[PDB]
Structures are given as C-alpha cells and as structure tokens.
Amino acid sequence: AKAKTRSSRAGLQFPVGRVHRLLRKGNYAERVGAGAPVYLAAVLEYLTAEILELAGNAARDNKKTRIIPRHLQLAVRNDEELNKLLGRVTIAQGGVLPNIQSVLLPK
Amino acid sequence: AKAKTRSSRAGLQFPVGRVHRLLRKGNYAERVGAGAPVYLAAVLEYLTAEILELAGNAARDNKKTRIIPRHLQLAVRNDEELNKLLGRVTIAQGGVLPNIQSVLLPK
Amino acid sequence: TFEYIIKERALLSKVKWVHMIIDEGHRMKNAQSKLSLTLNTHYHADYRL
Amino acid sequence: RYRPGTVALREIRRYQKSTELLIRKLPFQRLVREIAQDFKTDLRFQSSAVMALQEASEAYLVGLFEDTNLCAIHAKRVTIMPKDIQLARRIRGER
Amino acid sequence: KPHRYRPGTVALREIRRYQKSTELLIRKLPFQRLVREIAQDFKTDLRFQSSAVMALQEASEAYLVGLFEDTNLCAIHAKRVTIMPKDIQLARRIRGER
Amino acid sequence: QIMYQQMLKYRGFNNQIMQLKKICNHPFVFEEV
Amino acid sequence: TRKESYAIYVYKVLKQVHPDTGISSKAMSIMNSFVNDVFERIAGEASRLAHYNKRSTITSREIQTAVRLLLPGELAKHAVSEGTKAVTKYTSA
Amino acid sequence: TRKESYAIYVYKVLKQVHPDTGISSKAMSIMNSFVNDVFERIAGEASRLAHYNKRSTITSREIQTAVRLLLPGELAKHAVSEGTKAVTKYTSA
Amino acid sequence: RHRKVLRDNIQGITKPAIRRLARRGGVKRISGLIYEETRGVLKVFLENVIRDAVTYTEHAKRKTVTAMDVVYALKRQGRTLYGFGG
Amino acid sequence: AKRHRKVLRDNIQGITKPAIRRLARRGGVKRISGLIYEETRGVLKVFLENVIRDAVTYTEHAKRKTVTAMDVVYALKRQGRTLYGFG
DNA sequence: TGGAGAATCCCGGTGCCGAGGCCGCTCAATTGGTCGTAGACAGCTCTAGCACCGCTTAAACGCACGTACGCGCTGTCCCCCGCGTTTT
DNA sequence: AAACGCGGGGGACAGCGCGTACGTGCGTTTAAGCGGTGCTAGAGCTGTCTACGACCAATTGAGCGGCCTCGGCACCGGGATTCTCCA
C-alpha cells in the first residue's frame, strides 16, 4: 500500500525493496527472508562507501573533483585486498600505473 | 501411470523423465521444453560412451579388466580436448602420466 | 605369539596343528580385532583349549 | 649518434603514466569487422563491440611483457627472447 | 664393481616410478595430525573425516608436484638443474600465486 | 584443585576424562603447565 | 530404499561400450559425480542463456546453443548431433 | 520505461562519502556495471549454499555465510558487522 | 554489391605499436624475435571470444554485433570489465 | 630426555625431508636446494589453510561439527582444486 | 663532479559538454491478508570418529663426501635501437 | 605515422673457472603406522509444527527518464624546471 523503501529502514541508499523484488525474482530460494535483501544491500552500501572514498581520493590526488576511471584504477588496484578481490575485474579507461622494471631502469 | 522410463523412447539408458524432472528441479526455466532433457541425456550418453571408451582402453592397456582412476588419469590427461577442457579437474588415485623432464635425464 | 602368527600366517599355518594352546583369552575378547579370524587361517586345531 | 638501448624507460614511465591504448584504430575497427565477419557475416557493426575488447587485449599483453622480462631477467637477459615469453606462458598456463 | 654414484644420478627412476605409479608421498600420521592441527587452528574440536584428509591430500601432493615442474622450468630456463627457491617464487609469480 | 574447576570450565576433544586423571598424579604431564 | 543413481546406467553404457572392461566403483563414483557435474554445468549455462534472452522455455535448441558455446571442437559438433540424435528418437517417440 | 539505474544511489553514497569529488559517467558506468554483477555473484553462491542446506528459505545468515567464506579479512568482518548491522537497523526499522 | 571483408589488420597494428606496448609492458631491448611472436598469440585471444560471441548472435536471431554479447563472452571467460552496464 | 620426553617436531615439518625429496622427484627436481624443503613446506601450508577455514565455514553454516570430504568438495571446487573420487 | 639541452612539470587563459540535478509519473516496491509449510525443532540412536598404545621397523635420519654445476669472469659481436625520414 | 634506415657500442653469449653441494651411501634409529581398544557423539533419524514470507491486493511515491543548467577539467601558450649526456 504505502510505497516506502527499506533503505531508510536500514540506513542505506540502495533500494533494498528492489533488492527484495530481485531476490524473490532471483529464485535463489522459495522463502526469501527479507533480511537477506538487507544483508545484501547493507554490504552494497558499505562497499560503495568503501570504493567512492578511494575513487574520489585518487581523483583529488590527481587534482580532480570528478572521479574518472583512471582514478578508479588508482583506487582499486593500489588496494591489496581490492586487487586481491578483483584480480580479474577491470575498469575501462582506467589505464596503467607507472612502474618500470628494476634492471631495466639504470642503477 | 507406471514408471515406464523415457530413455527407452530415446534409445537411451538415462531416463529422460528423470532428466526432465531434474530440469524442472534445477530452476533452469519455467517451461522445460521436453527435448531439452533428451538433449541432455543424449549428450550425457554420448560422453558416457566417449569416456568409457578410453577408460576400458587404458584399463586393458594396463592388462586389467577393472577400470580404475589411475586408468582414468592416463586416458583423460593424454587427450587434447578433454584435458584442455578439464585442466582443473583432478582424479583421486589417478596420479601422474609417467614422464620425466628432458635435461634432468642423465647423459 | 600374537602378532607373530599374524605376520607369519603364510608359514606356520600351512603346517597342520592338532592341539593348540592359546593363553590369555582376554585379548581374544574382541572378534572385531585382527587376531581371532587368523586362527581360521591357522585352518585346523582338533584339540583346543 | 647514440648507442643501442637507452630511451626505453621513460616510455615505461609515460605509457604507464598515461591511461590510453597504444594501437592503430582504423586497423582496430577493421580488425574487428575482420574477425567478427569471419564467423558470421552481415553483422551491422556497433562500435561498442568494436572497442569493448581492446582493454582485454592490450593490458593482458602488457602484463605478459612483464612476465616475459621476468623470465628474461630470471635467465638474466634484457634483450628479451620468446623463450622467456613461452616459458612464462607455460607457467601462465597459456603455453 | 661398486656403484657409488656422484650427486645427481639415482633420482630419475623415482621420477619414473612415482609418475608411473599413482600415490601420495607423505607420512600420513604427520599428515592427519596436520589436518587436525590446521583445522583446529580455525575452530577447534572437529570430528574428523579421514575422507576429508585424503580428499585434501590428493589435491595437495598433486599441486606440490605441479609446482616443481615450473620450478625446474625457471631453473633450466636460468640454465640450472639444481633448483633454487627463486625459481619457485618466480614460478608462483608467473603462475599468479606469488 | 583450581585446574579441577577451571579446566572443566573450559569443557580439544576426549580431554575431560584425560585431564583429571593427569593432574592428580602430576601437573608436569602437561607441557605448558 | 531404492534411490535413483547412475551406477547401473553407467554400467549400461559400460556394457554398451566396454563390456570387456568391468569397472571399479571409484571410477564409477568419478563418473557419477561427473554426470551431475556437467548436468549442472551445461544447464546452468543454459539458464544463463535463458536469462541472456530472458526466456522461460529452455528447449533442446537452447541446449544446442549451450553445446555450441561450451564445448571445444568435436565435443560441440558431436554433442550437437548426438544431443539431437536421441532428441530425434524422442520427438519421434 | 523505468529502468532501475544506479547513478543516483551510488551518487548518494558519493555525496555521503567523497562529496567534493564528482564522478565521470564512464566511471559512473563502471559503477552501474558493478551493481547487478556483484548483486548476482554472491547470489548464485548463496543459492548454491541454499541447496547446500537444501533449503527453500534464505535468511541473512545465508548472506552472512556468503560474506563469511569469501571476503578477504575485515572486508568480510565489517560486512559481517555491516551486513548484519543494517539488518540490525532493519530489524530495528 | 560491395563485399566489405577485412583481414589481418594486426600488421596495421604496427611494430611501432609493439615498441609502444612493450614499454607499457616493461620491455627494454625488444629483440626482433618478439614483435611478431606477439602478433600471433593475441590473435589466439581474438577469434576465441567471437567464436562464442557470434554463437550468442544466432540463437538471439540477429545479424548485428552488440557489446552485450562481448560482455557475455568475456564474463563467460572470466574477463570481467566494467563501464558497460550490470 | 628420558626424564621428560619432548620429542615432537611439527606436522608441516612432520612431513620429512625424504618426503619432500619424494615429492620433488615426482615433481621434477634433480638437485634440491636445502631451502626448498622449507620454502616448499611454507607454501604447502599456505595452500592447506584456505580450504579448511572455508570448510569449517560450511560446517558452521551447515551447523555441524564433522568437517567432511563433502565440505572438501564444497570448498576445493570453489577454491579451484576440483577432485574426482570424493563426491 | 659540471653546463647544454631536451624533456617534463607547472601555471595562466578558454571554453565547453557532461555531471548533475528538475519535472513528472508511474510502477515497483510496500503493505496487507493469507498459507501450509518449511524448516523448526523435539526426540532418538547409534554410530563413527574417538584417542590409545604394542610394536615394528624402515624411514627417517646421521653423516662422509665428492664433485657439478652454478655461478665467477671475460670478450664479444651484435644487434637492436636512435636518430633522421617521410609517407602514409 | 610510419617507416625506413643505421651507427653503434655494449649485451648476449660463449665460455671458461671453481669450488662446493647436495646427493649418496650407509649407519642409526624411530616414530609410522598398525591394531585394537572402548566408547560415544553428534550424526542421524525421525517427529511434529508452526510461521512465514507467499502471494497477491492495493497503493503509492520512486526514481529515474526526459528536461534544465554551467563549470571541472581538458586544451594550449608560455615559461620554469629537471633529468641526462658528453666535458
């Protein structure tokens, strides 16, 4: 009846009711305990907070107040657990980080 | 009515209504198009023949009428497309194919 | 002895025995253990005790 | 003039100081029509599917050249040789 | 005529016969005690499937054997038959582990 | 006697019969003790 | 307690294929695992296709598409034909 | 056509978290490419767990296990907190 | 009535492009043995995607190429990339 | 010594240097360095732990105390060491 | 250890299109009642993991040592790139 | 850009040295593992049970597509800076 999303109920921004609609519509199990959408969208909000910090951080480190994908590369890949977590996940136009090989560089 | 198993209709050993039952069970689609279980049980029996072939081959190559997982290793890992497709599948009590590095061989 | 009829089942059980004497049957207690069924590989003991 | 060898590394700076691709683009789009038209023709070629694979190619190749020199300097060379590349791709599991 | 070999010679039949055979190469009571020790270190007091013990061991010793080939690939690639740990760590590197 | 209550208050496996037979003879059967 | 397995069916394809070679139950278990293994592989790939094009009737056309995609070389084209073969035996029957 | 777009909610998190910094729509497309991708990774893992428990229910304990097995270190443990905590906020609201 | 079919732009991908990317990949003395040793191996990468990706197209009953099935194939190969929806 | 035993080594080191020699011969080592027997052991245990921690995680989500070979199937498949003959 | 110069980094002026919000207008997300049923959860049992030692004994370990190979050191030649070129 | 060259000098490479290491043999145990216990634990099997979100009716504002900017950052002009190669 009253359309009121669960993101304020859990303190999030991501629509946990869209999460529950997609959860019942994801057929992961028949009974879909609605706390499982919240356990999803909570980690969504928490890791979006984890990543937008780093993205704007690398942006402002590149003197930028808009996150470009190069800043996403410098955000994720410099983090050891993000690169350990996203070993095969890529950011388009993130580019490359500056690193010359050791005996290639003169000593 | 009775369990008159649907593999005999397809000339198979794998009961295609157990396969249709499993496809209705596996949440692959709402309607399970009744040839999809026959496609499944047919590819199944084709590969069962594929591997039981090389399995009996390697077993009698080891002069045993009992097909063992060591024979499964020595038949499967000798194949290009199988071991290319199963590079990450391990056979317990399969062991190694007998082969040495070339320069470690004494001269 | 106990384990030396177990490891030596291939020799002294081939020769025939008529009277066997087995001592201290409290280790003979378990029929699930290794010891008891090897006396049927000992194959004969007309007199027993 | 100069010797063989010197001006590599600032490139290794600048390319990796930068974010772009290092490849010709009319050969890129023509190569995409080339390879996708070889399986099934008559594809109306969106440039999305064209450019969607170049990051998947060039960055992995760049990663391969590091493994190449890893096997080259482990075998103590910087004139890199395909023995280093294919031993890498072996231990990468490509070769 | 005695057969004392020089450092290098005897190994290869084992390299034959191990790869001719299909088994594990480890004392199992130090292995099952390793299973119970390591699995206790995450959460103590498990009842312990020995099926789990060998189900780990088969993937263990195969991966172990699998690493030594790339180790000697780096070794002979660096022109060595005496393997080094730097071969192992470079092998794990190009394998993506290191 | 503190080991009687304290180690029973811990309550690995098969130790609860073993630990009380031990400490009444010696504490020195335990390596850490 | 008759519980449906594939041990007598792998036995059926065994004595259809290698009746000269009996089996160890270890190899039988490897194959019984493998049956449900690829039975889940191809059908999860097929449900992936059924969500690629948002479809709810997976037919043998869709398993044909999955066999086209997943399997390398002849393993596709044989399971293209063989997966059609008993299909043509069952669509007849 | 109301297509559930993830520019505004991720941007709400940006105005929560790095609000000085905007986000390019290439980067915003990286986020929009991230969203349902991650929403289905642990979801397929969790339905696999739901059949590992052989359950037609899924609770937040199941997502908790999806956090428990998989995530590296405190990325698990904070999401052990956070995934429960907003659940603890949703069980409070 | 004009048939537009292209072939081997991987040399239109220049050897200076390798003198670019080998530096981006950290190579100093790219020997002459390397430059075309590259150009075959990546082509192994090239067809194998589209061999599946064209396979997406016809069951989809289409005669165009989208990057949607590029993403289907790359994620299907474990080549996850963002910037494209998901 | 005889007064108190104190005769333990380890379980990772309970794997013997002839056992490392055995695996090194199955793996293709001609001359093992002495550092290999421990650099091997380290990465061996490194491989060992990550499986069984998530196997216990299964065991707790499946509410059990017996960590199974079923859990080894549940983990090794997911940890990329899929093994035939145990499930 | 030093200047000449070539590359880089930085800083000032321009402007723009993309980032972001504005304006409906749903439609999906919610609330509101089931709905048996799913797993909630009690009981039962029995088993299956449980250490443990008797003991062997061969495996591991204890050590002599012998030399092999891996590096110590060199000259090279080669070889690949750098500077210059233009065209494509 | 490509593209074609092109000194050019040192990097690959050969190759020789050297010395030690790492197996090898064999002496020395030794803990490996086997049996063999004794038992019991939670697994396992059942035993009911209810609650739980299902599901669907109503609703409703969510939120996002289409509609409004104007400004973060790119581009470029000019200069300062800063690394490198031959004195």
Residue numbers in the entry:
A (entry chain Q), B (entry chain U): 12 to 118
C (entry chain A): 872 to 920
D (entry chain S): 40 to 134
E (entry chain O): 37 to 134
F (entry chain A): 1020 to 1030, 1047 to 1068
G (entry chain V), H (entry chain R): 29 to 121
I (entry chain T): 17 to 102
J (entry chain P): 15 to 101
Can you quote the paper on this entry?
SWI/SNF is the prototype chromatin remodeling complex and regulates the expression of 5% genes in yeast. Within SWI/SNF, Snf2 functions as the ATP-dependent motor that drives the fundamental DNA translocation reaction underlying chromatin remodeling, whereas many of the auxiliary subunits target the enzyme to specific loci of the genome. To understand the mechanism of nucleosome recognition, we report the cryo-EM structure of the yeast SWI/SNF complex in complex with the mononucleosome. Based on the specific biological activities involved, the SWI/SNF complex is delineated into three functional modules: the motor module, the actin-related protein (ARP) module, and SRM.
To facilitate protein expression, truncated forms of Swi1 (residues 251–1336) and Snf2 (residues 430–1400) were used. The structure of the SWI/SNF–NCP complex was determined at an overall resolution of 6.9 Å, with a local resolution of 3.1 Å at the nucleosome bound with finger helix (FH) of Snf5, and a local resolution of 3.6 Å at the substrate recruitment module (SRM). The recombinant SWI/SNF complex bound to the nucleosome in a manner similar to that of the endogenous complex, supporting the complex was reconstituted into the active form. The current higher-resolution map allowed us to identify several functionally important elements, such as the FH of Snf5 and a YEATS-like domain of Snf12 (more discussion below). The Snf2 motor serves as the major gripping point on the nucleosome substrate and provides the driving force for DNA translocation, whereas the regulatory ARP module binds to and stabilizes the helical conformation of the HSA helix, which directly contacts the motor and regulates the remodeling activity. We found that the tripartite organization principle of motor-regulation-recruitment also applies to RSC and BAF, which provides a unified theme to understand the functional modularity of these complexes. Because the DBL is positioned close to the exit DNA, the structure suggests that different transcription factors interact with the DBL to recruit the SWI/SNF complex, and the motor will then slide the nucleosome away from the transcription factor-binding sites (on the exit side), potentially opening up the promoter regions, consistent with the role of the SWI/SNF complex in gene activation.
